[PDB]
Amino acid sequence: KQHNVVAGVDMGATHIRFCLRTAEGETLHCEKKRTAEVIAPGLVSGIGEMIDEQLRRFNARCHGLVMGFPALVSKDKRTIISTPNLPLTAADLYDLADKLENTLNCPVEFSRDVNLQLSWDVVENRLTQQLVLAAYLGTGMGFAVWMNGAPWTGAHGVAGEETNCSGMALRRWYEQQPRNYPLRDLFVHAENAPFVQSLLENAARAIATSINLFDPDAVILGGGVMDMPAFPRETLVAMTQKYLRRPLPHQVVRFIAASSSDFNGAQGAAILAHQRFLP
Amino acid sequence: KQHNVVAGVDMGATHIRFCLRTAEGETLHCEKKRTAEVIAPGLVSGIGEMIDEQLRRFNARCHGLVMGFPALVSKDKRTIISTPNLPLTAADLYDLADKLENTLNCPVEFSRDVNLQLSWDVVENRLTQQLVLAAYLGTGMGFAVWMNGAPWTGAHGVAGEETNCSGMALRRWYEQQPRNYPLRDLFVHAENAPFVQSLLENAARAIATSINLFDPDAVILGGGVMDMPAFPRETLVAMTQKYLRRPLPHQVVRFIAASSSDFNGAQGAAILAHQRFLP
């Protein structure tokens, strides 16, 4: 049984997620591999063989690849323009889009990881025709924009770019002295720490600033910091609402909690590949 | 000699500027009237007769009106959604777009005043095909966006919306105690006042925040505060550049000084009317 597919790959420091989506919009396959294993034969050979084994298995023809990176990506989506925190060399990233195209025999585009999460969340929340802003609080504060039916990256591809309002800032505060609880449980025991409340207020000001400037239909809040036990999502939303201009955008902007699931990112990439390289 | 024209009107507290632009892109007429005089017969009758006298004079047919207000304007450009600081009643603004259309026999759109200045500056700087951000420092901090060949207003028309970083903040500081110099000469004598330097740093942070989020090709800096004698434009640009993410957008965003001339706003409105209602 033949299949026409697109490939979605989300590239992490420890794992790589990979999804195959049919022309019909069906998820044909999803897998998670360890990054170290995939790149052992060289990055291009590794990805090429990871994808091609599944194409051969499902008798699939691949019409394109969207690959996610925790890094800045050029306007034309072909060049990684910041050093990603991945176990890859400078040489590996060099001319990667062309090398992947030659090996995979289909177009290849790159995307910043937060656009993949944004795409999953926009499609899942029925927001594809709206102006949507996403704030992803992880190791740093990640912001993304959905506009005109696609992720929006500005003039040079770097739209949506805080030292002390991030996962790194929380880690550095935690590390100041010995704690009776693990870092992952910080919000269970330290939600009311003066420094933690200042971080939440800051994040709130930043989110509210972005909302006042874009005037979106909706705002998706998420990131790895929001997945931590006892993270006060309701307090952050209420803090942000204090700074929204009234009557509009205060009375009309809708707040959505981001989906946090293993394959969302890879699936997001597959959805973007489908839009760009099909129907 | 027949003429096909569009009307551009910029509405101020003291004066109203009015421009007629031909289908051929020629400025046929410009005039400045006192707002009080124009509205003496009622606002609709006043504007209708101000425009119609010139149409009769030039034997002109009007294909549309873009009218500027120091106020928020709805997404569909037909409703003024904040109270403007003009000598008009609530009743005068009510259903104004329809009343003007019936009287003038052409389509009528409204625009926030800063979009008119933005349009003049974008066309004059050959930036119509770029992503352009404008920061207009007047009584308040006004921001505007040019994207996809036109002013961009967000989902609800209020994109681009600081208590102590504005013309009002400078006025209130000036008024704290008697001064040996007039308010208009504040930057000649008080550029280095600790409060004035804090205002400039704040404006810089705000401008830099907007640039980091939109990642524009260019930024137009202006407003009535920048027209004041000795305003340190170079210091503000240098302060803003400290906060721009490097290499991009720091090494590629271009800074432009806004044009400050009597009819720029009315002309901006005429340019928008031409785009919307001609060729």
Side-chain angles (χ1 to χ4, degrees), chain A residues 2-125 127-163 165-170 172-244 247-279, chain B residues 2-125 127-163 165-170 172-244 247-279:
Chain A
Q2 261 283 318
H3 284 276
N4 285 297
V5 302
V6 291
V9 174
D10 197 13
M11 202 90 175
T14 307
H15 299 87
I16 295 179
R17 281 82 168 176
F18 161 48
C19 173
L20 287 180
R21 181 178 172 95
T22 66
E24 299 74 17
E26 199 75 20
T27 301
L28 193 66
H29 175 75
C30 293
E31 67 186 52
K32 184 162 65 168
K33 295 219 175 316
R34 296 181 57 74
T35 303
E37 305 288 331
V38 177
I39 75 189
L43 181 60
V44 169
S45 289
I47 293 296
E49 182 46 26
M50 180 191 68
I51 299 164
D52 205 50
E53 182 164 26
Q54 305 305 319
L55 300 182
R56 291 188 313 267
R57 182 195 179 193
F58 292 103
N59 187 26
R61 289 178 48 214
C62 192
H63 296 249
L65 170 63
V66 172
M67 192 175 276
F69 291 87
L72 293 169
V73 178
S74 62
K75 181 52 173 186
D76 73 348
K77 308 168 194 172
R78 298 188 66 74
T79 315
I80 307 307
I81 66 184
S82 71
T83 301
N85 189 359
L86 296 176
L88 304 170
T89 67
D92 290 12
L93 294 176
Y94 181 76
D95 206 40
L96 188 61
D98 286 341
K99 291 185 204 291
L100 287 171
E101 287 189 341
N102 289 322
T103 300
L104 299 168
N105 307 137
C106 66
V108 180
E109 282 179 10
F110 301 149
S111 179
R112 183 164 55 107
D113 58 0
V114 295
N115 296 320
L116 277 43
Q117 184 62 46
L118 172 70
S119 303
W120 175 263
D121 291 321
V122 168
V123 167
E124 177 151 280
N125 290 281
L127 300 177
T128 59
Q129 311 307 298
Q130 273 72 288
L131 175 54
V132 186
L133 233 59
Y136 292 113
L137 185 50
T139 58
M141 175 65 76
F143 182 92
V145 179
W146 184 273
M147 189 193 305
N148 303 318
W152 186 84
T153 61
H156 318 295
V158 311
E161 299 290 304
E162 312 311 307
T163 61
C165 180
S166 52
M168 194 174 312
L170 281 164
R172 186 171 56 266
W173 170 80
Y174 176 87
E175 292 171 352
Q176 292 177 1
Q177 61 188 72
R179 308 299 183 175
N180 293 323
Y181 52 92
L183 176 48
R184 192 164 172 283
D185 293 339
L186 178 153
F187 293 100
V188 181
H189 307 279
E191 180 178 337
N192 306 111
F195 178 89
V196 176
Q197 287 286 311
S198 289
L199 176 142
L200 294 166
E201 277 289 349
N202 265 53
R205 290 183 191 96
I207 293 161
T209 302
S210 77
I211 290 173
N212 289 339
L213 294 177
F214 285 94
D215 180 35
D217 289 283
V219 190
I220 302 164
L221 298 187
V225 178
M226 305 203 197
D227 300 331
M228 294 168 180
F231 180 89
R233 184 182 288 280
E234 296 172 355
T235 301
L236 181 70
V237 173
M239 289 170 177
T240 303
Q241 286 175 329
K242 301 192 295 185
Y243 309 104
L244 299 182
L248 284 55
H250 181 255
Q251 295 182 352
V252 68
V253 68
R254 304 191 310 284
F255 284 85
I256 298 79
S259 181
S260 179
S261 186
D262 200 14
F263 295 110
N264 289 352
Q267 286 259 30
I271 290 159
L272 297 174
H274 194 290
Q275 287 178 8
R276 295 167 187 184
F277 309 126
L278 293 178
Chain B
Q2 261 283 318
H3 284 276
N4 285 297
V5 302
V6 291
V9 174
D10 197 13
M11 202 90 175
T14 307
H15 299 87
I16 295 179
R17 281 82 168 176
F18 161 48
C19 173
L20 287 180
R21 181 178 172 95
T22 66
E24 299 74 17
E26 199 75 20
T27 301
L28 193 66
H29 175 75
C30 293
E31 67 186 52
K32 184 162 65 168
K33 295 219 175 316
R34 296 181 57 74
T35 303
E37 305 288 331
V38 177
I39 75 189
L43 181 60
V44 169
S45 289
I47 293 296
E49 182 46 26
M50 180 191 68
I51 299 164
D52 205 50
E53 182 164 26
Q54 305 305 319
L55 300 182
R56 291 188 313 267
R57 182 195 179 193
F58 292 103
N59 187 26
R61 289 178 48 214
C62 192
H63 296 249
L65 170 63
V66 172
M67 192 175 276
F69 291 87
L72 293 169
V73 178
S74 62
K75 181 52 173 186
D76 73 348
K77 308 168 194 172
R78 298 188 66 74
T79 315
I80 307 307
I81 66 184
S82 71
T83 301
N85 189 359
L86 296 176
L88 304 170
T89 67
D92 290 12
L93 294 176
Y94 181 76
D95 206 40
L96 188 61
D98 286 341
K99 291 185 204 291
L100 287 171
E101 287 189 341
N102 289 322
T103 300
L104 299 168
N105 307 137
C106 66
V108 180
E109 282 179 10
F110 301 149
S111 179
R112 183 164 55 107
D113 58 0
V114 295
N115 296 320
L116 277 43
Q117 184 62 46
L118 172 70
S119 303
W120 175 263
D121 291 321
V122 168
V123 167
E124 177 151 280
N125 290 281
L127 300 177
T128 59
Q129 311 307 298
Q130 273 72 288
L131 175 54
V132 186
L133 233 59
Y136 292 113
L137 185 50
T139 58
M141 175 65 76
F143 182 92
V145 179
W146 184 273
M147 189 193 305
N148 303 318
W152 186 84
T153 61
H156 318 295
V158 311
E161 299 290 304
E162 312 311 307
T163 61
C165 180
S166 52
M168 194 174 312
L170 281 164
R172 186 171 56 266
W173 170 80
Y174 176 87
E175 292 171 352
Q176 292 177 1
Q177 61 188 72
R179 308 299 183 175
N180 293 323
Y181 52 92
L183 176 48
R184 192 164 172 283
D185 293 339
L186 178 153
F187 293 100
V188 181
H189 307 279
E191 180 178 337
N192 306 111
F195 178 89
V196 176
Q197 287 286 311
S198 289
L199 176 142
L200 294 166
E201 277 289 349
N202 265 53
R205 290 183 191 96
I207 293 161
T209 302
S210 77
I211 290 173
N212 289 339
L213 294 177
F214 285 94
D215 180 35
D217 289 283
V219 190
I220 302 164
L221 298 187
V225 178
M226 305 203 197
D227 300 331
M228 294 168 180
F231 180 89
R233 184 182 288 280
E234 296 172 355
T235 301
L236 181 70
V237 173
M239 289 170 177
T240 303
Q241 286 175 329
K242 301 192 295 185
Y243 309 104
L244 299 182
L248 284 55
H250 181 255
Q251 295 182 352
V252 68
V253 68
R254 304 191 310 284
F255 284 85
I256 298 79
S259 181
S260 179
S261 186
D262 200 14
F263 295 110
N264 289 352
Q267 286 259 30
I271 290 159
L272 297 174
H274 194 290
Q275 287 178 8
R276 295 167 187 184
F277 309 126
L278 293 178

